[PDB]
Amino acid sequence: GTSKLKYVLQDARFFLIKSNNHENVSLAKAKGVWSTLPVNEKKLNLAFRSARSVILIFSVRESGKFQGFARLSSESHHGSPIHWVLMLGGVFKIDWICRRELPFTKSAHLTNPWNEHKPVKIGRDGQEIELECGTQLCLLFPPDESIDLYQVIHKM
Secondary structure, eight states: HHHHHHHHHOOOEEEEEEEHHHHHHHHHHHTTTTTTHHHHHHHHHHHHHHHOOOOEEEETSSSSOEEEEEEESSOOOOOOOOOOOOOOOEEEEEEEEESEEEGGGGTOOOOOOOGGGEETTTOOOOOOOOOOHHHHHHOOOOOOOOOOOHHHHHHH
């Protein structure tokens, strides 16, 4: 069902994360980590302290799709190096909420007030997505029955 998902997204903040290649998103899915340029690292650390949940919604450039979404479980911290394909700051730990894809064609009815009401697929890496549009975007994804949000809820 969708009820634990809606609970996780209650009063959350949402950020569009753009990746240049699929390999980086695959690494993030396997290891539960993300890293970003310093301008976005500061924004996400501020958001992590400000909100019950901070959700990163991932899209690989030119793919025409989002590749899933995850919740920050930590602020950034400077561990085992990660063989990203590229200056990058610290490492955020993340819990995946959905590892399934969603095509941009399916989110055409959602506009982001914090980016001039352009379709939510449009935005620079780090663009914040307003609460309502972000919640509806996350609910469009196909359910990921491999994930149990019980442990995610316990970290909030």
